[PDB]
Ligand binder design. Structure first.
Ligand SMILES: C/C=C(/C)C(=O)O[C@H]1C(C)=C2[C@H]([C@@H]1OC(=O)CCCCCCC)[C@@](C)(OC(C)=O)C[C@H](OC(=O)CCC)[C@@]1(O)[C@H]2OC(=O)[C@@]1(C)O
Ligand SMILES: CCCCCCCCCCO[C@@H]1O[C@H](CO)[C@@H](O[C@H]2O[C@H](CO)[C@@H](O)[C@H](O)[C@H]2O)[C@H](O)[C@H]1O
Ligand SMILES: CCCCCCCCCCO[C@@H]1O[C@H](CO)[C@@H](O[C@H]2O[C@H](CO)[C@@H](O)[C@H](O)[C@H]2O)[C@H](O)[C@H]1O
Ligand code: NA
Length: 1000
């Protein structure tokens, strides 16, 4: 982007001037060529980088280098203070600080990388949830949603309530009665501000004075408007205020709490073992009080404590957790489950209740009129209707009307003529043929578009359509009907009457003798009471009780039937008041205007459930996860749908498991709480009922997933453990949620729960693996110090094992395939400890065997080895007396006790045991005989890499001279194998005990 300013003083220009400056028609929008040129000139609508990645690594490197240099200077001060009179052994005090320096450098490197890895994992979340916007462009007549970064200056953009403003926008037209905007992120204003479209004359006016502009980042609090993009990217008012840092996420995840508890307890245990080593050596309490005995006897305990600290901490664990979470997040996003916060992953597996909206999530929101009836014959008490069916489930105008499964012509019935007239006039929506996809798409609400499609199918006025193109066919019959009745105005919907109407005057064309007419479309509950008459074809009879009961009976049948239809009543005021009589500024009077109606007919439209919903409901059943439907349908239809998708049984009694908002409010408080623990169906629900349901569900210590999309959903989404916003819904709901459904599908919720379970299981696996490895290392150190043996392992090798040798297999355990019963077990408790009970004893045995095996191989080299000396046990424990008391240990050089061969034996045994235990860590209970090792190929590859690196630091000459190791032969490797492989048998015995005797 070269020109970084775009249009200046857009608030000062008028709408005409702003459209003229970019040369765009407001009707069509930008042409593809205009979009290409503007994108090339002004660049994408986005801000560069994160916060400052080009100068961030240097900061952390220099900060940790300062933290290293200060410890170096402190240790130097200590060693220099140990020079005044302490001059006994200055040779041994020369090796310890070198190792400590290496430890500090290594821990600094990993502490930098793990932090950067976590930051990159957090930042990768944003790539999965790209901000979207709605534009009108010349290639399509309907509004199309695109990525906000693809919006360019001059674009015509549409914003509605709950949307996030994608660019700095000059308001062109306010479609709603008022436009209120929340500008708290910019001006810091509290209450929403009112916008207009008049120009603001002051060129240097403040943002609060720019009452005709929409600033990027702000949110539409109320209304709907159209505008033209003035500036994008950095030129945006919010792009100038790039200096803004919100508070961190905080709120420690339960896993982090358990890990920190482990850290504190491990500090205590390190202190306990450091004291226990002194407890073993009681003879040190018989030494003289003066001299240099206590000093040199305390230096040894200030070193073994450091070695034990290296052996005890799983240094590489946080990187493995971060990588597992990042890759699982990418997997979930590949499966349409867009996680907005890493903690939510852990929570996803604990989900005990899923509260889902019906329309759009459990169903496809692809509405279609499939049944309709009008009045046939009325004889006092007898009432007969003309029922019909309609084929075609999409919005395409393809299908026909069927009477008793036989096609008829809709124009024969005057009732159906009026039916179609009402459906065409009480309709703000239309159809647009997408020639690229080659399909018909909706322009407006699914309901009104289904009405439009029905009018196209019916063709009550008999119009030629076989010679029309796909574009001319979409809105042909509706245009025909519009040519006759001229819509004077529209009485908008209102809750108090549950209907809408249009005042229409007939055009002066052989139909002016009809007079003005009001056409009413609404819910039967609201419309039928206001009908005094009933249209019979072209005549009219008075509306009575029996007719009303017949209408209601058929509506009930369709609502509770196999199709679970939502019916719409259609009526018309034949003798409406005059335009001068009616006032339109207050909807409270509209119900009065829509009185003395004539009932014409009823349309039954279906919103089919998604074909995967039943199976996902079953999966939640097997997983012990309750599913509660929340719908706008009536209670009867709601229960019928619950039986259709499997929430309820086809024959079970549900008088206490299905409620309406009013019924739920009529119950006392204790009964409300008690009803939430059993209800699975809520119909006709107020926005506060979601929050109340979440609170009641929390009162039973349940982890609730609650779906939403609108602004009134935001509080509940905030209270719920897993707020789930729809991908097509508002931005306000998305910002208040833990997960977004890219496809708005309930099955995606189920898949997210399953994936969270699997990911937490694999995390448990590699956590227990690494920590049992650390247990084994600590046991090795303590067993060596207790028996007074030489150091079988040095802390450098321990760092290499914890960071490199074991880091690869743990990351690979992150990719373990999920168990076949992952969704046939109850939800995990969030307070579930990772290692306790039988697992404590199991991994304690494992770690004890690890330490015993390492130290025992180190001891085997000194004794029963051809390459090793003929040293016995009584002198190997007294090896420090070799240089002095030589006749007691006469034989070879004393330096043979500082040999690299026993350390190499111990390290090889540790590495082999850790590969074997990684193989054992593929499952918690299943033995290797049942689940083969070749199921997780990444584990095999990681073990190959670990062994290749081991052979590298053993044989490739420059490296074993650094690791203080010596290459081995076939006999020593065979000993390593013989003393390492039985760990598989040990864990196999423990698994057999857990399976065949510890299931309860
Ligand atoms: C790494 C080296 C070991 C020795 C260690 O200190 O870990 C202990 C300790 C801190 C716990 C223990 C370890 O305790 C022992 O192994 C007893 C040692 C006695 C030997 C002396 C006999 C001569 C864990 C390791 O035991 C083994 C047997 O599995 C399990 C678990 O750890 C976890 O669940 C990991 C959580 C991140 C913790 O009980 C944990 O403390 C609690 O806070 C938890 C919940 O952490
Ligand atoms: C003065 C001494 C300092 C200089 C060191 C000389 C270079 C050493 C060669 C090894 O390089 C290391 O290899 C590790 C693994 O191959 C990496 O660990 C990374 O990968 C592990 C597992 O893949 C994770 O557990 C670790 O956290 C993560 O640091 C680590 O980054 C990297 O440097
Ligand atoms: C695209 C446009 C075409 C679609 C229009 C659909 C046509 C239906 C319009 C009906 O108009 C009303 O019809 C009533 C009869 O059905 C008339 O009542 C007349 O007849 C009744 C009995 O038939 C009497 O009870 C009433 O008093 C007397 O007003 C009434 O005046 C008239 O306004
Ligand atoms: Na929430």
């Amino acid at each position: 982007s070269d020109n970084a300013i775009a249009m200046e003083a857009a608030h000062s220009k008028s709408t005409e001037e702003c459209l003229a400056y970019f040369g765009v028609s407001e009707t069509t929008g930008l042409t593809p060529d205009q979009v290409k040129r503007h994108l090339e000139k002004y660049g994408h609508n986005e801000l560069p980088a994160e916060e400052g990645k080009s100068l961030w690594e240097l900061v952390i490197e220099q900060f940790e280098d300062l933290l290293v240099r200060i410890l170096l200077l402190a240790a130097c001060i200590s060693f220099v203070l140990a020079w005044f009179e302490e001059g006994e052994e200055t040779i041994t005090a020369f090796v310890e600080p070198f190792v400590i320096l290496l430890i500090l450098i290594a821990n600094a490197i990993v502490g930098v990388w793990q932090e950067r890895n976590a930051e990159n994992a957090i930042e990768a979340l944003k790539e999965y949830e790209p901000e979207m916007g709605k534009v009108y462009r010349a290639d399509r007549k309907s509004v199309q949603r695109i990525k906000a970064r693809d919006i360019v200056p001059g674009d015509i953009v549409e914003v509605a309530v709950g949307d996030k403003v994608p660019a700095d926008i000059r308001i062109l037209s306010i479609k709603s009665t008022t436009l209120r905007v929340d500008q708290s992120i910019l001006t810091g204003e509290s209450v929403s501000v009112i916008k207009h479209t008049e120009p603001v004359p002051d060129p240097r006016a403040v943002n609060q004075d720019k009452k005709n502009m929409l600033f990027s980042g702000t949110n539409i609090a109320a209304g709907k408007a159209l505008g033209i993009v003035a500036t994008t990217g950095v030129s945006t008012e919010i792009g100038k205020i790039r200096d803004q840092m919100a508070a961190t996420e905080q709120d420690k995840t339960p896993l982090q709490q358990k890990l920190d508890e482990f850290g504190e307890q491990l500090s205590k245990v390190i202190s306990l073992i450091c004291v226990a080593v002194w407890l073993i050596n009681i003879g040190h309490f018989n030494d003289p009080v003066h001299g240099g005995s206590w000093i040199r006897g305390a230096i040894y305990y200030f070193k073994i404590a450091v070695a034990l600290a290296v052996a005890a901490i799983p240094q590489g664990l946080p990187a493995v957790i971060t990588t597992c979470l990042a890759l699982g997040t990418r997997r979930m996003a590949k499966k349409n489950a867009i996680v907005r916060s890493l903690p939510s992953v852990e929570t996803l597996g604990c989900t005990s209740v899923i509260c889902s909206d019906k329309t759009g999530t459990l169903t496809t929101n692809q509405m279609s009129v499939c049944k309709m009836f009008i009045i046939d014959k009325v004889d006092g008490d007898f009432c007969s209707l003309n029922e019909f069916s309609i084929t075609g489930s999409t919005y395409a105008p393809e299908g026909e009307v069927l009477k008793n499964d036989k096609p008829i012509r809709s124009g024969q019935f005057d009732g159906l003529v009026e039916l179609a007239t009402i459906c065409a006039l009480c309709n703000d929506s239309s159809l647009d043929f997408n020639e690229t996809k080659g399909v018909y798409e909706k322009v407006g609400e699914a309901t009104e578009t289904a009405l439009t499609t029905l009018v196209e199918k019916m063709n009550v006025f008999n119009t030629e359509v076989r010679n029309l193109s796909k574009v001319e066919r979409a809105n042909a019959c509706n245009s025909v009907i519009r040519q006759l009745m001229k819509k004077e105005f529209t009485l908008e919907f209102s809750r108090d009457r549950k209907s809408m109407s249009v005042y229409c005057s007939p055009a002066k064309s052989s139909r002016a003798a009809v007079g003005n007419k009001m056409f009413v479309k609404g819910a039967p509950e609201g419309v039928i009471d206001r009908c005094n008459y009933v249209r019979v074809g072209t005549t009219r009879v008075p509306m009575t009780g029996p007719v009303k009961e017949k209408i209601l009976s058929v509506i009930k049948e369709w609502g509770t039937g196999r199709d679970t239809l939502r019916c719409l009543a259609l009526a018309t005021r034949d003798t409406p008041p005059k335009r001068e009589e009616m006032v339109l500024d207050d909807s409270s009077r509209f119900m009065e205007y829509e009185t003395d109606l004539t009932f014409v007919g009823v349309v039954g439209m279906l919103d089919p459930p998604r074909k995967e919903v039943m199976g996902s409901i079953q999966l939640c059943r097997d997983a012990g996860i309750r599913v509660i439907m929340i719908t706008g349908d009536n209670k009867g239809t709601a229960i019928a749908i619950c039986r259709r998708i499997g929430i309820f049984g086809e024959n079970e009694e549900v008088a206490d498991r299905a409620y309406t908002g009013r019924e739920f409010d009529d119950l006392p408080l204790a009964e409300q709480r008690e009803a939430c623990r059993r209800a699975c169906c809520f119909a006709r629900v107020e926005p506060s009922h979601k929050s109340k349901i979440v609170e009641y569900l929390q009162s039973y210590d349940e982890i609730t997933a609650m779906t939403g999309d609108g602004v009134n959903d935001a509080p509940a989404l905030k209270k719920a453990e897993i707020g789930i916003a729809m991908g097509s819904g508002t931005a306000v709901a998305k910002t208040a949620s833990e997960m977004v459904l890219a496809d708005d599908n309930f099955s995606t919720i189920v898949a997210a729960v399953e994936e969270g379970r699997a990911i937490y299981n694999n995390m448990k696996q590699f956590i227990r693996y690494l920590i049992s490895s650390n247990v084994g290392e600590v046991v090795c150190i303590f067993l060596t110090a207790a028996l007074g043996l030489p150091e079988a392992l040095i802390p450098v090798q321990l760092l290499w094992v914890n960071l490199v040798t074991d880091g690869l297999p743990a990351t690979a355990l992150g990719f373990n395939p999920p168990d076949l019963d992952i969704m046939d077990r109850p939800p995990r408790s969030p307070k579930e400890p990772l290692i306790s009970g039988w697992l404590f004893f199991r991994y304690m045995a494992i770690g004890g065997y690890v330490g015993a095996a390492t130290v025992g191989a180190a001891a085997w080299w000194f004794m029963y080895a051809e390459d090793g000396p003929g040293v016995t046990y009584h002198q190997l424990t007294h090896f420090m007396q070799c240089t002095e008391d030589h006749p007691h240990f006469e034989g070879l050089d004393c330096e043979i006790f500082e040999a690299p061969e026993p350390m190499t034996m111990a390290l090889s045994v540790l590495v082999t045991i850790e590969m074997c235990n990684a193989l054992n860590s593929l499952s918690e209970n299943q033995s290797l005989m049942r689940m083969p090792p070749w199921v997780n190929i990444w584990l095999l590859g990681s073990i190959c890499l670990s062994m290749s690196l081991h052979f590298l630091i053993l044989y490739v000459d420059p490296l074993p001279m650094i690791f203080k190791l010596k290459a081995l032969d076939l006999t020593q490797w065979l000993m390593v194998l013989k003393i390492s492989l039985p760990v598989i048998g040990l864990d196999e015995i423990l698994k057999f005990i857990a399976r065949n005797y510890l299931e309860g």
